[PDB]
């Protein structure tokens, strides 16, 4: 009851409130229930496991110290503080969380968690039910329940010996022999695909294997071709060990995201697909282009304010330094190709004649005036730009390259986000904010939307759609450290 001059006087984060709950509840031990120690531990596990929080890890091993070494006084009053920092946690991460996921990490201990939370917490542990609380403050969000459910069934299956699928040859395609069947079989059983009418003793990939074999590849986001190359083999091959992480991670990460869908646009970076959810109904699904690896789409919430159609492009700084006008260097046909203007001022813009400029004298770098393409079935925005002001200038617009939409892997963007239907987009944001087109314009038109929309750009390398978990490449590399 009284402080016992152990390390645990540095561990606690909020002493003041820890002593409060204390004297409110009799200074009684809350912990003394084990079933209800395990299901806290078991939570700070996935928080863990997830390894965006240095902060929850270090208690947890605090924790898990104290029950090995029998001295549950101490565990009791950690886990006490650690059960606030929980609820800050479960509560702040909507408004501040992408700090802690892509940003940076939890390192630090939060502000202690609302009066309603406390409320809640005192009542809570009134009626023993801290358990019930901790699940009380988890997404009541059905994507959420999915990831944890499958994170449980896999925990037990963790650490149990399943053969790696090897294979001598790189492809191995419908009808080639395979050297490792019962080893591929069991790794689409472990995702947990329809093993069941794979024929048993075949010397080779049959037409038994080729479903679940496609199935897999969709489920993975990879090429749908059937062929068990590298790509597929590195899925089928990851250990339960690191899906689990995936799940912990992209589960804890639902936190940042609320599923609102009374009128919201989702961009997964990962996936590269959006939806725009309007009346709690999906009323567009789109595949997008996202940015490289090297210039990344940010993980953001901005607002769709408007449309412009036909949209100019004011080709941004970086872009004209690094990519534009070092080919303009070389082609002295590109500007007049690319529709391009060269334009001195923001406001009262002049249009520069190109060939006035000595081309093999000009520094990029120092290059005293901006590229603005005309409008254009060609124009880089294509027909379409979906105005998301924001201050790292991230939008979505539609793309005369629709070639791209084809690669399973679409991260080629300097950042903005392309838009495969645009047309349709566009055609639903009006319909569903009652905004009417007369007729077609034939000119760059702005088109302010009744309704800010929000847009949230998120990153869940594992979600559940229509049935099944879907798993995404970690593009940026946000899921490393996690995967180790």
């Known amino acids: 009851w009284i402080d016992s001059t152990s390390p645990v006087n540095e561990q606690i984060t909020n002493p003041a409130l820890v002593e409060q709950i204390y004297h409110s509840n009799n200074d009684q031990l809350l912990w003394s229930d084990l079933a209800t120690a395990n299901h806290f531990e078991a939570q700070l596990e996935v928080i863990h496991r997830a390894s965006f929080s240095p902060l929850f890890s270090r208690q947890l091993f605090a924790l898990k110290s104290y029950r090995q070494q029998d001295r549950w006084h101490e565990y009791d009053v950690l886990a006490t503080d650690t059960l606030l920092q929980y609820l800050s946690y479960a509560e702040q991460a909507p408004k501040v969380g992408i700090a802690w996921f892509f940003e940076g990490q939890l390192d630090q201990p939060l502000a202690p968690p609302s009066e309603e939370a406390q409320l809640a917490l005192h009542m809570a542990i009134g009626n023993q039910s801290l358990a019930r609380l901790m699940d009380e403050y988890t997404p009541q969000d059905p994507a959420y329940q999915q990831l944890l459910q499958a994170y449980q069934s896999l925990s037990s299956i963790e650490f149990n010996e399943v053969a790696l699928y090897e294979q001598m040859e790189r492809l191995k395609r419908p009808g080639d022999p395979l050297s490792h069947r019962e080893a591929l079989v069991q790794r689409l059983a472990l995702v947990n695909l329809d093993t069941t009418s794979i024929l048993n003793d075949v010397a080779y990939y049959d037409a038994s294997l080729e479903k679940p074999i496609k199935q897999f590849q969709k489920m993975h986001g990879l090429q749908t071709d059937g062929?068990?190359?590298?790509?597929?083999?590195?899925?089928?091959?990851?250990?339960?060990?690191?899906?689990?992480?995936?799940?912990?991670?992209?589960?804890?990460?639902?936190?940042?995201?609320?599923?609102?869908?009374?009128?919201?646009?989702?961009?997964?970076?990962?996936?590269?697909?959006?939806?725009?959810?309007?009346?709690?109904?999906?009323?567009?699904?789109?595949?997008?282009?996202?940015?490289?690896?090297?210039?990344?789409?940010?993980?953001?919430?901005?607002?769709?304010?408007?449309?412009?159609?036909?949209?100019?492009?004011?080709?941004?700084?970086?872009?004209?330094?690094?990519?534009?006008?070092?080919?303009?260097?070389?082609?002295?046909?590109?500007?007049?190709?690319?529709?391009?203007?060269?334009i001195r001022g923001w406001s009262d813009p002049e249009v520069i004649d190109p060939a006035l400029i000595d081309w093999e004298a000009v520094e990029p770098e120092t290059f005293p005036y901006?590229?603005?393409?005309?409008?254009?079935?060609?124009?880089?925005?294509?027909?379409?730009?979906?105005?998301?002001?924001?201050?790292?200038?991230?939008?979505?617009?539609?793309?005369?390259?629709?070639?791209?939409?084809?690669?399973?892997?679409?991260?080629?963007?300097?950042?903005?986000?392309?838009?495969?239907?645009?047309?349709?987009?566009?055609?639903?944001?009006?319909?569903?904010?009652?905004?009417?087109?007369?007729?077609?314009?034939?000119?760059?038109?702005?088109?302010?939307?009744?309704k800010r929309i929000p847009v949230h750009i998120i990153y869940q390398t594992v979600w559940y759609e229509e049935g099944v978990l879907h798993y995404r490449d970690d593009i940026y590399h946000y899921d490393a450290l996690a995967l180790g």
């Open 227 to 342: 062929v068990i190359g590298p790509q597929t083999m590195k899925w089928l091959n990851t250990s339960v060990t690191e899906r689990l992480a995936l799940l912990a991670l992209n589960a804890e990460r639902i936190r940042l995201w609320p599923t609102q869908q009374d009128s919201m646009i989702v961009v997964n970076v990962p996936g590269f697909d959006m939806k725009y959810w309007d009346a709690g109904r999906e009323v567009f699904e789109s595949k997008v282009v996202v940015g490289k690896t090297t210039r990344p789409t940010p993980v953001m919430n901005t607002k769709l304010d408007s449309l412009i159609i036909n949209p100019t492009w004011n080709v941004p700084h970086k872009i004209m330094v690094e990519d534009i006008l070092p080919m303009v260097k070389r082609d002295s046909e590109y500007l007049a190709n690319h529709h391009m203007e060269i």
């Open 370 to 450: 901006r590229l603005r393409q005309q409008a254009g079935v060609q124009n880089a925005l294509g027909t379409y730009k979906f105005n998301t002001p924001n201050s790292r200038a991230i939008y979505l617009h539609d793309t005369p390259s629709k070639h791209l939409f084809n690669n399973a892997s679409r991260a080629f963007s300097s950042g903005c986000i392309r838009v495969e239907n645009a047309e349709k987009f566009a055609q639903t944001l009006l319909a569903n904010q009652g905004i009417t087109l007369d007729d077609f314009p034939v000119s760059t038109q702005a088109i302010a939307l009744k």
